[PDB]
Write a protein that binds this ligand. Structure first.
Ligand code: B1C
Ligand code: DST
Ligand code: MG
Length: 297
């Protein structure tokens, strides 16, 4: 048992370290209210992963973006949901804002089967403009067509984007501090399906050739269906973060993030998100970079 208390304290400090390393590299001052997220991730004593992310818009660097993934093998998804919602409610209380939950509420509405959840995340994207700050939640469902339909109904709605409805498993919620809220649905293609002829016909055919090149180094591909019908954001799960510069033409701000993380003590994979048209450019100006670390007993 003494092994357990020592390892719990150590995990608590390693999560805070991962968060501070990211914040201190990109923001001289922490963005308020980061310490509420720090308290939340330290209260999650089961196994988890953390995500630290940068959104780059030309030379603007948005870096107070963090996410916890619940990975306790007991899979008490409903308990994790409740722990995330009470953290959101603490943000509301301390900041003095009211979050608009209606989209999450309607998605969960008609008696939710939590056994169909395979991923749950909770986190933040904090800005000095409070109204532009947001809380975040992702839910991945499996073999749950009733809730797939409900998420589609909740976003912009039917076609198009409906052309990729059968590829959807991940649902994203954003909760802005001004009371605006959004839902997003993500179509995915797994590595083992990359070369199948039906996949080229149903998916790749609708994307420029440049969109296909980073699949060579990716184990997974996502795209958001409802935001930006024009110019959809494309997400690539790079097997090795070192391949980023080989497949994506980085500007100066993104290169600074990449250089910082090349030799950090983190997981080897990353996610890269970029709008479809950025890949047709000679140089990406808008890109989102996501890095990860795991925290296990
Ligand atoms: C655990 C498995 C099934 C391998 O992951 C998923 O396909 N879901 C993604 C979805 C996701 C990725 C990044 C995010 O920031 C949010 C959600 C994931 O969790 O890795
Ligand atoms: C698509 C998965 C792989 C990455 C997380 S996407 P997000 O919607 O939470 O981040 P953005 O809203 O695109 O900035
Ligand atoms: Mg989004």
């Amino acid at each position: 048992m003494i092994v357990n208390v020592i390892q719990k304290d150590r995990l608590k400090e390693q999560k805070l370290q991962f968060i501070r390393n990211h914040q201190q590299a990109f923001d001289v001052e922490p963005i308020y209210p980061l310490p509420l997220f720090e308290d939340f991730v330290t209260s999650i004593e089961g196994d988890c992963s953390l995500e630290a992310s940068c959104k780059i818009e030309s030379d603007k660097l948005i870096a107070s973006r963090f996410l916890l993934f619940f990975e306790d093998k007991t899979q008490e998804w409903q308990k994790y949901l409740h722990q995330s919602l009470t953290f959101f409610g603490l943000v509301e209380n301390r900041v003095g804002v009211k979050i608009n939950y209606s989209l999450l509420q309607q998605f969960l509405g008609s008696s939710f089967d939590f056994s169909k959840v395979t991923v749950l995340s909770a986190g933040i994207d904090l800005r000095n403009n409070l109204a532009e700050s947001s809380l975040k939640m992702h839910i991945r469902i499996k073999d749950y067509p009733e809730k797939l339909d409900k998420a589609f109904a909740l976003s912009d709605g039917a076609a198009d984007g409906n052309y990729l409805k059968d590829f959807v498993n991940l649902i994203g919620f954003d909760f802005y501090f001004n009371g605006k809220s959004e839902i997003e649905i993500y179509a995915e293609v797994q590595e083992d399906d990359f070369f199948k002829p039906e996949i080229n016909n149903l998916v790749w055919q609708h994307f420029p050739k440049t969109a296909l090149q980073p699949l060579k180094a990716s184990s997974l591909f996502f795209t958001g269906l409802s935001k930006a019908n024009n110019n959809p954001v494309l997400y690539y799960h790079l097997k090795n973060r070192q391949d980023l510069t080989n497949y994506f033409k980085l500007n100066d701000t993104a290169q600074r993030v990449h250089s910082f993380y090349q030799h950090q003590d983190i997981l080897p994979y990353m996610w890269v998100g970029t709008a479809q048209k950025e890949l047709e450019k000679t140089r990406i100006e808008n890109i989102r970079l996501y890095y990860y670390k795991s925290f296990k007993m």
